[PDB]
Amino acid sequence: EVKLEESGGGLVQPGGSMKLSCVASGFIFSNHWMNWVRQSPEKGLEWVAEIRSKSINSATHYAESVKGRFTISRDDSKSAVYLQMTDLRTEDTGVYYCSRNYYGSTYDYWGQGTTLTVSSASTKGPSVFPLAPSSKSTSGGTAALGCLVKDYFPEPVTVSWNSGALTSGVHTFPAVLQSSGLYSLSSVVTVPSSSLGTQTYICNVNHKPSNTKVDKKVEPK
Amino acid sequence: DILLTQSPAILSVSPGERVSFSCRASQFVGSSIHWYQQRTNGSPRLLIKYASESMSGIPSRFSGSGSGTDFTLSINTVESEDIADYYCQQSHSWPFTFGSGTNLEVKRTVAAPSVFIFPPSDEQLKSGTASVVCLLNNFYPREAKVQWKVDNALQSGNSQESVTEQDSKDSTYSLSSTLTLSKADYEKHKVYACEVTHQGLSSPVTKSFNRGE
Numbered sequence: 448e449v450k451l452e453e454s455g456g457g458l459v460q461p462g463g464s465m466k467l468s469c470v471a472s473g474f475i476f477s478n479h480w481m482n483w484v485r486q487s488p489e490k491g492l493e494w495v496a497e498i499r500s501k502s503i504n505s506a507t508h509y510a511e512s513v514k515g516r517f518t519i520s521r522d523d524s525k526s527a528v529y530l531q532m533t534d535l536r537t538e539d540t541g542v543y544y545c546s547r548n549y550y551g552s553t554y555d556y557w558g559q560g561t562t563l564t565v566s567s568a569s570t571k572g573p574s575v576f577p578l579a580p581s582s583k584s585t586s587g588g589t590a591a592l593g594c595l596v597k598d599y600f601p602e603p604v605t606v607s608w609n610s611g612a613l614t615s616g617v618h619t620f621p622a623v624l625q626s627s628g629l630y631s632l633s634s635v636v637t638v639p640s641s642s643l644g645t646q647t648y649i650c651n652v653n654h655k656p657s658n659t660k661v662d663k664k665v666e667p668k
Numbered sequence: 669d670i671l672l673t674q675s676p677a678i679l680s681v682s683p684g685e686r687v688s689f690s691c692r693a694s695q696f697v698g699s700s701i702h703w704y705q706q707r708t709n710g711s712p713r714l715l716i717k718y719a720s721e722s723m724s725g726i727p728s729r730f731s732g733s734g735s736g737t738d739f740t741l742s743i744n745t746v747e748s749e750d751i752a753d754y755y756c757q758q759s760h761s762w763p764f765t766f767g768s769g770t771n772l773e774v775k776r777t778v779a780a781p782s783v784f785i786f787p788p789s790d791e792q793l794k795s796g797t798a799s800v801v802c803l804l805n806n807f808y809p810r811e812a813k814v815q816w817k818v819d820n821a822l823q824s825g826n827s828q829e830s831v832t833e834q835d836s837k838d839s840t841y842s843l844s845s846t847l848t849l850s851k852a853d854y855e856k857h858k859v860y861a862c863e864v865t866h867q868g869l870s871s872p873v874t875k876s877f878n879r880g881e
């Protein structure tokens with residue numbers, strides 16, 4: 448199994464710096480070309496940088512829109528590829544994917560992405576409130592419950608239920624930007640109404656830029 | 669640089685039908701077009717390389733064709749699990765470029781939403797704010813109307829809605845509407861109601877509660 452795992456995203460002021468990392472496994476790392484490809488609502492999928500093998504001088508190539516500001520590097524002893532970003536701009540905001548390109552053809556493996564936000568605003572961790580089940584959130588044999596993840600910045604937060612053991616029926620809604628400048632979202636799950644008060648439901652909320660890791664037990668009302 | 673034009677940007681098809689995605693290159697790219705699938709909250713997955721060679725593990729209903737500047741991705745019988753965005757990519761010349769993507773919606777029979785309402789939590793109320801949430805779960809088609817009434821007074825400008833992307837297991841959408849009030853304005857009223865209209869409902873559905881019950 449090939450795996451690529453990015454990290455290092457977060458919030459940075461305009462003009463600031465930030466270094467992304469990616470660790471690879473499942474192929475002979477030092478023989479292959481590692482890439483960063485970013486994604487944003489405005490520009491879609493956009494190749495950013497490539498570093499090729501040590502055997503051909505670890506040659507680095509950059510998209511014209513980041514040339515001079517970004518530096519890609521690799522450490523073959525760690526199976527790591529890095530992206531040092533400087534003089535960051537608002538338009539650099541996006542999801543940054545670590546990706547392998549098969550010698551100038553397909554991007555045949557991708558990581559899961561790490562999110563970069565270039566903004567003058569500050570980091571704020573979320574507050575987490577239960578959306579408690581009751582008869583008012585029961586529809587026949589289905590009950591709904593959830594978690595309200597309120598007043599955080601920047602994106603993203605991840606939510607899981609019962610430490611990931613509960614995935615069926617879960618909807619985590621796209622975040623909305625409130626007038627305050629802070630994001631807000633709800634994660635809900637639908638369950639059998641008979642399981643209210645007999646099964647435990649805990650939403651696990653993670654907001655890395657503020658190092659919030661909160662588990663919230665959601666109880667019937 | 670080579671521009672890949674993917675048009676149309678949205679496709680909507682019924683299950684069991686054949687669907688075709690179009691990718692046109694502004695210059696000759698030979699056969700060096702690659703197709704990717706990106707599911708909601710996921711990463712692009714390689715499907716076809718070099719216009720028509722499907723990768724190992726891709727279901728056989730996927731196939732590609734074309735050469736020169738005109739390329740097609742086909743799904744000969746579409747299922748809900750095929751709901752995603754589809755991107756093309758050229759590696760004929762540097763730099764490699766991607767199309768803008770086409771989104772695939774798979775139609776289904778009309779499904780009225782289940783409607784649920786949640787009062788604000790005691791914890792949030794202690795912080796001075798009351799958020800009331802109305803959930804419209806697993807409906808189709810996407811269009812739905814949500815109105816907040818507080819003691820039968822229609823509310824305006826104090827709510828926000830968020831809609832999920834179409835679900836690949838059952839082709840439905842879900843929607844949340846959050847009404848936010850100060851604790852002071854929350855305590856000045858009693859009845860908090862959520863009213864939902866949708867193609868699948870024979871008449872509007874109202875979910876409500878009395879504050880403090």
Ligand SMILES: OC[C@@H](O)[C@@H](O)CO
Pocket residue numbers: 588589590615616637638639640
């Ligand atoms: O999440 C499915 C819900 O409708 C349950 O009643 C079925 O087990």
